[PDB]
């Protein structure tokens, strides 16, 4: 008929005997004296439907095959995580169990009710696996900061690939009060050591304002960590939503780190796009768009942002040392910063030896009237170096305020001192109001002064200013009434090309030079009478002389002749006459000197001394007569 | 005997009853009243050889295990793609079905008959999987551009790993005509948004010349895309084959992109190695070898190539704005460019505010005679900055033409204006023929002039030129006949070390300086009679004076004494005598002046004025006699 | 009863007949005339427990499923490698068999007895798989260098992910003798071509000192290779152990390479952290800590280290060309170097055209007295460019020796020539003792001289030195006795701000300038009698004059008047009187000159010539009397 036998209570089964369970599944006896009921007791029985009873061609059991094949890539889904379900339990189970672990892929979205703690020395792979926050993640009251994925106090994690985080702030907005609120990061690692945190793409955080001891957290946050690496791509939803209160703060946030590397992209942040604070940290090509805070904040010590790509702030592109204890050798190493309401780069008073190199434009985008805040580079601090490249027309934005603005308020404990300035660009001013400032500039097309040095520039060296088709190359405008204000200020080489107004100086420099023979060759071919080959001209602004002629004194290398077949010197002097400075010359000539009269109708003379130290003039009579010594 | 039962037409099968199919496979009844013929009708039957009827140790079915294990890594080969077969159908099936997808490995080579379209938001992994083009890929007539893998109009692709492409142009060379041809890219993405395209290694393309509206495509091509990233390593087979016609064009081609990043390696390209055009695009360390076109072409706006590694072109290393509408702030940010037939870097007339920093050598490798094309840096455009580092001996190549060549043809709407030049190196010239040029140079070992400023240099500032063991530091050689030509040209500090010939100037600069006390200390220890401590010397090139002495006038700080126990001034004058300029001195001395005669046998004198403005000389008689006023 | 039938010797089995083996496993006949004993002979029998006799829902066999699922990710463990066992055989088996191959994960540690040779064109993936050396790896006598993983003479490897290596030197320390020892690298590739070697984390090597022809190997070593890429993170255990002899040498070692890229991290190395030698090689952000050798050694040709991060050496941060044939255009492209016993950067005599740009501090940390070795930058070679940024206070370390020290020992075949120096920083000296040196400096807070130029500076141009609150801006201190020593040395613009002592010069420069009108405008408002508007002052150091007044000669632009309502010139002369230089003036004035007496009680005069060339003085009598010509 058919094959069917149940267990018989009275029978002894030999080895290899097959029967059925009440379920229908077939059992074989492994023993010769089998009396055991396989429905109750599998002692000396095997189920023939077992994986361990299927054989591959190789000689491996199917069991052996499933075991080795699984152990290659242990997944969250192996632990019964479900995409579009709460997977919390399953996730934590997976982590606790598996040193190497696969999250899943781009089609996976695991819902998480509790903070996911990574484990020490583990390796995690991820193909685009998303994690989504749900209620309860904020954890226990007195609320302390949490994340979806956490590596707080973890050592030697590796993450290979892409992890995605989703926080909807609208779920959490009703929780806490005035004093205490949830803080929910995408990723947090506080006190992590030597971790590669792979790649993140994260939307949203939860960081509503609470009144005492408010702590901002990033979407992606690494705090108090050592030798950690992450890549992160965050969206803060600023300008993509309307919200009652400020939901989220900083995009990507690094704070009190040592030796930590970011590859960083931030948008739509209600505070700072990227903040990176600490010691020997690196921001590698940060890319920031449309942030309510500053695009990029650096502090700490020897923290460098390389090849920046910043656009669109309610504040500035770059703060150095904003709200910070320390900003020592915090550097920006090339890039582009555009469309800031205030400054491209604000180097705060805290800054020590910060180096900024930047292409920058469309600062001072504020509706608000011009201030120190509306600068390209706004510089305070101690011995900062600016390498400015700028253009005012760039990206069809209209600037407000100086290209560079370096300034103290007082010479007594100055807020800005020892700054080095290197500035090239088109169509705004460099303003300096700070001691010991070293200035190099190339400026094209400024309406006004290329460069001004105002008050409080004591001991500034202006090495070189080249100005093409400006209002004025340089003006020095010190505090006249105070010797201290302009003491030791050196204006070096000023280069004027088709500037409207001459440069304006103050003070007299002391210069020490090597002995020279200076040789001026004139190629020209032809020289008319009293033609200047080479001159130095000294002009006065004396009270006593009001009226257009102000030549005080001059030395002129002259063509003496209507042929240029003789040459001399013009030793120029001056005296007040008819409310003007009248000029006259001692003429140094081949075989003669000639002293010219002070004015028409005055005689000229030679003053000599007797041995008794009385003084005598030889002065012509208007006749061909004996010369006599006339007392003077 | 044995176990064998077929279906019986007359029998009712109880639950758990096992029989055989005619095939021999065993069936169990799931029902108590089974009358159904399992050969025809599996209603209430199960095949006992099913995966769903094998149980792992865990409690999972084998079916459940195969389902979860597959869904980890869905592959092309799961969809019945075969390596070394046409896999087109299978591929497209795989893509349509699977959000996450594995290509395969280095031993996989899938043959593709039709363009492979990726899908939006998908994640693709690849371990070296190769795709090979076959006939039909060119698609339908009127031929439009195709690729092996395509992401035209795709959003949010991720590619993890390495994809390899093979196009043999020899399959496609007979297709189209004069007017219409196939275009076959390795990879194309036209109008892609926010895609990471991982890593490519691609050989060959199909892009034969057709007569109207010819469109070049890359081996690897990203057109009209936003926020896309690729790495690509291409071979164009130029110099590895002989071909009737030009088969392929550009290696890696980026055109009208916004915010797109390349890591790029190109060789053996019949056009450009790498071209990258657009807005805010980045070329990160492009590595180009042996290209018939230019090694690297930049255009658009704020497109930067970082840390270039270019060698071996029939054209140049770098074109900026070749055949382009726009080349505004298109920058090269360090690297090395060598072995160009023409220029290392050609900044075309289109260029606005382009910055080039480069080590460069072995330009002008052409057999053809020296031209503007045979330059290190060939610069036209508006306000480009050159940072040149060069060496003519470098890599044992022999250069032709100037190190830097900045030039307009006319001052009226000049093709080059406002260029900034910073040049250091060994053993070639800097030539400037352009207005408003700012020059800084350090040149060693040039045969001729370190620097020349030719015609059309109006309003150029030459800040500093240091020349070691050149022919000449600087020559200024303007259009003499035109005041406009040399108007406002400033030659600053020229530094001559063991140059053969003195520097040659033209024009006279107007300089405004801060008031100085200048203090020249001479350490020497010993000074002979008429020894010059410090001098200024003015020389003439007057027509009227032909014959070697051309000192017009001088001021000399002099040791007056054969002991150096007295010091004075020499006020030097000159007059034509015996077809030479004869020199004579007013001697300013402690307690005297001394006017020397113009020539031997002439008397000296003092000219003074009477109050009636007649002039009188005191002139010695050759006796110890009364001095009289003598009319003059 | 039950289901059980053995093979019967007398029976013919029809097709589909099932019996048992003596083992109990069920067999079905595939043939109608089966007479074959399945216990001895499986001809026309199948085992029903076969994978090929289980069917997935899809229609695939379980066999077909195991085959395709395995071939996705072939592993070492598939080949029966065991973690914490000797896996050598299994590994080599895996490699020989599989073009694509998975090592395993972070929980895998395979013990290796013999060098593992990779294969040409293969692709390897690794999730943190560790390999550990055991005895026998050193291989056969005469000992030749070995590694755990080897790619010597391999082409076109790819490695994706992270491989980890462990060498315990304590296993191998008893082997060889005086002449011959094991050399055991983590990874070695000698003569590899176009390989991506992914990522390494490696501890330890074996490289004990043997007396003739000692060859240092890296922990991670690439020798004589072309177009190879690696990332490597090594620990040499220096300072983590005590050892009898030097066990290991170089961390990461690149030697005679062409076009090879490193991402490099080294610590605790008994020699060099990272060495990279060859042609067109790149060290991308090398990160070195706590090394007994130099942190970083470059040689060869066009080898560049970018954005260095070096701290803590018994030697220096950077050697260029240490123990090398060639060091031509070997560059350091930004970064930070700190805490070297000797120099931050030593550019050896071999160096040609090396460019160094660096922030540097805490050099000369040695207990040993100041030498040339205790410099920030120690520079020898031919035409090296230094861009120095320095700070002596930085990181609370106390420096010893010059910031920069550029030096030859002789002008005859000089060890240092043609060096370019650009130096900014705080609180140490720049020393130059080398010909043709170009100097630019900005120095703050040096105790002594900002800059000194010593002996052997022939044909040096010091373009600009800015000194703020130094001891002295510049001193030039040549070999006085030798004209050659200071020939052609140009000291340009020296800027002194509140320096203690004036700059000290030697020699007189020849300067060629463009013709100028120089216009000095004085803004001041008020001028007293004999007030200097602008002056040049020439001072002597003559033997003959000992005693404080050393003004030799001067030209002074003067306010002539107690109102500043007249202006002139002061032409200053001097003569020895009462063991001082006494000053006197020719006064150039509006309508007069005035010659002042040499000293009180001397008369002044005018010297003129007769036509017979005899000389005559007009000199006052002390009366209102006839002027006579007095012979002189």
Q: Which residues pair with B335 in a beta bridge?
A: B308
Alpha-carbon distance B180 to nearest alpha carbon in chain A (angstroms): 40
Alpha-carbon distance B431 to nearest alpha carbon in chain C (angstroms): 18
CB A225 within 8 A of CB A280: no
Q: CB of A21 within 8 Å of any CB in chain C?
A: no
| Count of residues in chain C | 632
Neighbours of C139 (CB within 10 A): 14
Residues of C in contact with A535 (CB under 8 A): 516-518
Task: State how beta strands C109-112 and C532-539 pair.
Answer: unpaired
Rounded-to-integer distance, Cα C110 and Cα C126, Å? 13
Residues of B in contact with A561 (CB under 8 A): 575
| Ramachandran angles phi, psi of B72, nearest 5° | -60, -50
Q: CB of C514 within 8 Å of any CB in chain A?
A: yes
Q: In this complex, do C56 and B51 lie within 8 Å of one another by their Cβ atoms?
A: yes
CA B370-B374-B379 angle, 5° bins? 130
Neighbours of A215 (CB within 10 A): 12
Q: CB of A516 within 8 Å of any CB in chain B?
A: yes
> Over the Cα atoms of chain B, what is R_g?
42
What is the fold of A92-497?
A: Pectate Lyase C-like (2.160.20)
Instruction: Please write down the HEC assignment for all residues of B384-453.
Output: CEEEEEEECCHHHCCCCCCCEEEECCCCCCCCEECCEEEEEEECCCEEEECCCCEEEEEEECCCCEEEEE
DSSP codes, C12-57: PBPTT-EEE-TTS-EEEESSSSB---TTT--TTEEETTBGGG-B-T
CB C440 within 8 A of CB C422: yes
Residues near B58 by beta carbon (within 8 Å), at least 6 away in sequence: none
Rounded-to-integer distance, Cα C629 and Cα C632, Å? 9
Q: In this complex, do C468 and A512 lie within 8 Å of one another by their Cβ atoms?
A: no
> Among residues 244-283 of chain A, which lie with CB inside 8 Å of chain C?
280, 282
Alpha-carbon distance C228 to nearest alpha carbon in chain A (angstroms): 23
Q: Of all helices (H) and strands (E), which one includes residue B250? A: strand B250-258
Q: In this complex, do C497 and A461 lie within 8 Å of one another by their Cβ atoms?
A: yes
DSSP codes, B336-398: EEEEESS-SEEE-TTEES-EEEEEE-----SSS---TTS-SEEE-EES-EEEEEEESSGGG--
Instruction: Output the six-digit token pair for B50.
Output: 């099913």
Q: In this complex, do B520 and A514 lie within 8 Å of one another by their Cβ atoms?
A: yes
Residues of C in contact with A600 (CB under 8 A): none
Dihedral over Cα of A308, A314, A319, A322: its sign: negative
Neighbours of C144 (CB within 10 A): 12
CB C150 within 8 A of CB C188: yes
Q: Of all helices (H) and strands (E), which one includes residue C110? A: strand C109-112
Q: CB of B8 within 8 Å of any CB in chain A?
A: yes
Which residue of chain B has the CA closest to A626?
B628
Measured between its terminal Cα atoms, the distance across chain A in Å is: 159
Residues near C362 by beta carbon (within 8 Å), at least 6 away in sequence: C338, C339, C340, C394, C395, C397, C398, C399
Rounded-to-integer distance, Cα A318 and Cα A272, Å? 10
Of the candidates C453, C457, C394, C459, which has an alpha carbon nearest to the alpha carbon of residue C427? C394
Rounded-to-integer distance, Cα B17 and Cα B33, Å? 11
> Among residues 153-212 of chain A, which lie with CB inside 8 Å of chain C?
158, 160
Q: CB of B66 within 8 Å of any CB in chain C?
A: yes
Q: In this complex, do A158 and C591 lie within 8 Å of one another by their Cβ atoms?
A: no
Q: Of all helices (H) and strands (E), which one includes residue B71? A: helix B62-72
| Ramachandran angles phi, psi of A439, nearest 5° | -115, 125
Q: Of all helices (H) and strands (E), which one includes residue C68? A: helix C62-72
Give resolution, Å, one decimal. 1.5
Rounded-to-integer distance, Cα C605 and Cα A485, Å? 46
Rounded-to-integer distance, Cα C15 and Cα C377, Å? 91
Instruction: Assign residue A382 a region (left: φ > 0; alpha: ψ between -120 and 50; beta: otherwise).
Output: beta
The residue written with tokens 């504020």 in the block is A366
Among C1, C300, C616, C630, the strongest candidate for a mutation testing the B interface, having the largest count of B CBs within 10 A, is C616
Instruction: Please write down the HEC assignment for all residues of C227-287.
Output: CCEEEEEEECCECCECCCCCCCCEEEEEEEEECCEEEEEEECCCCCCEEEEEECCEEEEEE
Q: In this complex, do C495 and A436 lie within 8 Å of one another by their Cβ atoms?
A: no
Of the candidates C198, C233, C240, which has an alpha carbon nearest to the alpha carbon of residue C219? C233
Q: CB of A567 within 8 Å of any CB in chain C?
A: no
Largest CA distance in chain C: 172
Residues of A in contact with B329 (CB under 8 A): 359, 394
Residues of C in contact with A158 (CB under 8 A): 106, 128, 162
Q: Of all helices (H) and strands (E), which one includes residue B313? A: strand B304-313
Residues near A367 by beta carbon (within 8 Å), at least 6 away in sequence: none
Chain breaks in chain B (C to N over 2.5 A) after: none
Of the candidates C246, C202, C208, which has an alpha carbon nearest to the alpha carbon of residue C222? C202
- Of residues B54, B538, B598, nearest to A62 (C-beta): B54
Instruction: Please write down the HEC assignment for all residues of A106-117.
Output: CCCEEEECCCEE
CB A479 within 8 A of CB A450: no
- Residue ranges of domains in chain A: 18-71, 92-497, 526-541+549-601, 604-632
Task: State how beta strands A26-29 and A45-47 pair.
Answer: antiparallel
The residue written with tokens 């303007």 in the block is B478
Residues of A in contact with B612 (CB under 8 A): 601, 622
CA distances from A180 to A141, A176, A461 (A): 9, 5, 54
Alpha helical stretches, state H, A459-574: 483-486
Q: Which chains touch B (3 or more CB pairs under 8 A)?
A: A, C
Rounded-to-integer distance, Cα A461 and Cα B212, Å? 62
Q: In this complex, do C591 and A571 lie within 8 Å of one another by their Cβ atoms?
A: no
Q: In this complex, do B553 and A532 lie within 8 Å of one another by their Cβ atoms?
A: no
Q: Tell me C79's DSSP state.
A: G
Residues of C in contact with B470 (CB under 8 A): none
Task: State how beta strands B327-328 and B45-47 pair.
Answer: unpaired
Largest CA distance in chain B: 172
- Of residues A75, A559, A592, nearest to B72 (C-beta): A75
- Burial of C409-428, coded b for 16+ CB within 10 Å and e otherwise, reads eebeebbbbbbbbbbbbbbb
Instruction: Output the six-digit token pair for A410.
Output: 């007082």
Q: In this complex, do B1 and C3 lie within 8 Å of one another by their Cβ atoms?
A: no
CA C5-C6-C8 angle, 5° bins? 110
Of the candidates A243, C234, A587, which has an alpha carbon nearest to the alpha carbon of residue B553? A587
The residue written with tokens 């003429």 in the block is A587
- Of residues B125, B537, B608, nearest to A519 (C-beta): B537
CB B384 within 8 A of CB B414: no
> Among residues 294-353 of chain B, which lie with CB inside 8 Å of chain A?
302, 306, 329, 333, 353
Taking each helix axis from N to C terminus, what angle separates A62-72 and B62-72, rounded to the nearest 10 degrees? 30
Of the candidates C278, C305, C136, which has an alpha carbon nearest to the alpha carbon of residue C221? C278
Residues of C in contact with B534 (CB under 8 A): 508, 536, 538
CB A216 within 8 A of CB A184: no
- Of residues C70, C510, C600, nearest to A517 (C-beta): C510
Rounded-to-integer distance, Cα A593 and Cα B613, Å? 17
| Domain B77-497 grouped into CATH 1.10.10 | no
Rounded-to-integer distance, Cα C397 and Cα C364, Å? 10
Of the candidates C556, C534, C500, C536, which has an alpha carbon nearest to the alpha carbon of residue A507? C534
Q: In this complex, do B532 and A517 lie within 8 Å of one another by their Cβ atoms?
A: yes
Rounded-to-integer distance, Cα B165 and Cα B148, Å? 7
Coil, strand, or helix at residue A470? coil
Q: Tell me B34's DSSP state.
A: B
What is the fold of C81-293?
A: Pectate Lyase C-like (2.160.20)
Alpha-carbon distance C421 to nearest alpha carbon in chain B (angstroms): 12
- Burial of B255-289, coded b for 16+ CB within 10 Å and e otherwise, reads bbbbbbbbbbbbbbbbbbbbbbbbbbbbbbbbbbb
| Count of residues in chain B | 632
Task: State how beta strands C296-301 and C327-328 pair.
Answer: parallel
> Among residues 76-135 of chain B, which lie with CB inside 8 Å of chain A?
99-100, 121-123, 125
> What experimental approach yielded this model?
X-ray
- Of residues C51, C107, C309, nearest to A55 (C-beta): C51
CB-count exposure of residue C483 (10 Å: 0-12, 13-18, 19+): exposed
Rounded-to-integer distance, Cα B87 and Cα A163, Å? 32
Measured between its terminal Cα atoms, the distance across chain C in Å is: 159
Which residue of chain B has the CA closest to C3?
B3
- Of residues B105, B514, B519, nearest to C123 (C-beta): B105
> Among residues 589-628 of chain A, which lie with CB inside 8 Å of chain B?
589-597, 600-606, 618-627
Neighbours of A71 (CB within 10 A): 15
C-alpha torsion C427→C430→C431→C434, nearest 10: 170
> Between chain B and chain C, how many beta carbons pairs sit less than 8 Å apart?
357
Instruction: Assign residue C469 a region (left: φ > 0; alpha: ψ between -120 and 50; beta: otherwise).
Output: left
CB A508 within 8 A of CB B518: no
| Ramachandran angles phi, psi of A611, nearest 5° | -60, -30
Q: Tell me B13's DSSP state.
A: B
CB B395 within 8 A of CB B360: no
Rounded-to-integer distance, Cα A531 and Cα A534, Å? 9
Of the candidates C157, C287, C137, which has an alpha carbon nearest to the alpha carbon of residue C204? C137
DSSP codes, B181-192: --EEEEEEEES-
DSSP codes, A56-110: -TTS-BHHHHHHHHHHHS-BTGGGT--BTSB-HHHHHHHHHH-SEEEEEETT-EE
CB B146 within 8 A of CB B167: no
- Burial of A385-423, coded b for 16+ CB within 10 Å and e otherwise, reads bbbbbbbbebeeeebbbbbbbbbbeebeebbbbbbbbbb
Coil, strand, or helix at residue B67? helix
Of the candidates A338, C549, C538, which has an alpha carbon nearest to the alpha carbon of residue B519? C538
Coil, strand, or helix at residue A366? coil
Q: In this complex, do A535 and C525 lie within 8 Å of one another by their Cβ atoms?
A: no
Alpha-carbon distance A488 to nearest alpha carbon in chain C (angstroms): 6
Q: In this complex, do A513 and B493 lie within 8 Å of one another by their Cβ atoms?
A: no
Residues of C in contact with B523 (CB under 8 A): 504-506, 541
Alpha-carbon distance C629 to nearest alpha carbon in chain B (angstroms): 5
Q: In this complex, do A495 and B613 lie within 8 Å of one another by their Cβ atoms?
A: no
Neighbours of A579 (CB within 10 A): 10
CB B438 within 8 A of CB B421: yes
User: In angstroms, how far is CA B22 from the centroid of its own chain?
Assistant: 76
Instruction: Output the six-digit token pair for C122.
Output: 């293969």
> Among residues 439-478 of chain C, which lie with CB inside 8 Å of chain A?
442, 444, 464, 466, 468, 473, 476
């Amino acid at each position: 008929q058919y094959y069917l036998k149940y267990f018989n209570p009275d029978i002894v089964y030999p080895k290899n005997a097959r029967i059925m369970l009440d379920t229908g599944v077939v059992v074989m006896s492994m023993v010769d004296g089998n009396s055991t009921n396989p429905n109750s007791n599998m002692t000396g029985w095997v189920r023939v439907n077992s994986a361990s009873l299927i054989f591959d061609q190789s000689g491996k059991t199917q069991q052996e095959i499933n075991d080795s094949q699984k152990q290659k890539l242990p997944s969250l889904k192996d632990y019964g995580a479900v995409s579009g379900q709460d997977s919390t339990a399953a996730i934590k189970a997976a982590i606790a169990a598996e040193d190497f672990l696969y999250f899943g892929d781009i089609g996976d979205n695991f819902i998480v009710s509790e903070q996911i703690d990574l484990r020490d020395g583990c390796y995690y792979v991820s193909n685009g696996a998303k994690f989504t926050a749900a209620l309860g993640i904020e954890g226990s009251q007195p609320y302390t900061p949490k994340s979806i994925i956490n590596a707080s106090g973890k050592v030697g994690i590796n993450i290979s690939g892409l992890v995605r985080t989703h926080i909807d702030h609208n779920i959490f907005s009703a929780l806490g009060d005035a004093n205490s609120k949830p803080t929910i990061s995408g990723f947090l690692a506080d006190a992590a050591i030597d971790c590669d945190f792979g790649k993140w793409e994260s939307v949203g955080s939860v960081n509503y304002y609470y009144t005492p001891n408010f702590k901002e957290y990033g979407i992606v946050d690494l705090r108090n960590s050592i030798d950690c690496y992450i890549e992160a791509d965050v969206n803060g939803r600023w300008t993509e939503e309307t919200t009652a209160s400020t939901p989220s703060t900083v995009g990507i946030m690094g704070s009190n780190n040592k030796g930590c590397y970011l590859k960083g992209r931030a948008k739509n942040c209600y505070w700072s796009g990227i903040l990176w604070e600490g010691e020997d940290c690196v921001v590698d090509g940060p890319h920031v768009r449309n942030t309510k805070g500053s695009n990029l904040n650096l502090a700490g010590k020897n923290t460098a942002a390389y090849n920046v790509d910043l656009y669109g702030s309610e504040q500035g592109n770059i703060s150095i040392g904003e709200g910070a204890t320390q900003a020592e050798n915090c550097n920006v190493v090339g890039g582009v910063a555009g469309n800031a309401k205030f400054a491209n780069c604000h180097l705060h008073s805290v800054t020590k030896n910060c180096h900024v190199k930047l292409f920058h434009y469309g600062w001072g985008q504020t509706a608000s009237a011009v201030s120190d805040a509306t600068s390209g580079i706004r510089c305070q601090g101690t011995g900062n170096t600016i390498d400015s490249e700028f253009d005012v027309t760039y990206g069809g934005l209209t600037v407000k305020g100086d290209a560079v603005n370096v300034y103290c308020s007082t010479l007594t404990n100055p807020e800005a001192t020892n700054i080095k300035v290197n500035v090239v660009g088109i169509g705004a001013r460099v303003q300096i109001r700070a001691p010991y400032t070293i200035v190099n500039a190339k400026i094209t097309g400024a309406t006004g002064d290329a460069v001004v040095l105002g008050e409080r520039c004591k001991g500034s060296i202006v090495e070189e200013v080249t100005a093409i088709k400006c209002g004025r190359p340089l003006q020095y405008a010190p505090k006249t009434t105070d010797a201290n204000d302009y003491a030791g200020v050196i204006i070096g080489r000023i280069n004027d090309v088709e500037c409207t107004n001459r440069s304006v100086f103050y003070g007299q420099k002391i210069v020490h030079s090597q002995r020279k023979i200076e040789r001026i060759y004139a190629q020209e071919t032809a020289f008319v009478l009293d033609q200047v080959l080479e001159a130095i001209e000294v002009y006065t602004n004396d009270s006593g002389v009001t009226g257009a002629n102000k030549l005080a004194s001059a030395i002129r290398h002259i063509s003496a002749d209507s042929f240029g077949t003789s040459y001399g010197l013009d030793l120029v002097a001056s005296t007040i006459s008819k409310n003007n400075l009248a000029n006259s010359k001692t003429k140094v000539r081949a075989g003669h000197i000639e002293v010219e009269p002070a004015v028409a109708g005055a005689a000229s003379h030679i003053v000599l001394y007797a041995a008794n130290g009385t003084k005598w003039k030889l002065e012509p009579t208007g006749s061909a007569s004996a010369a006599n010594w006339v007392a003077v």
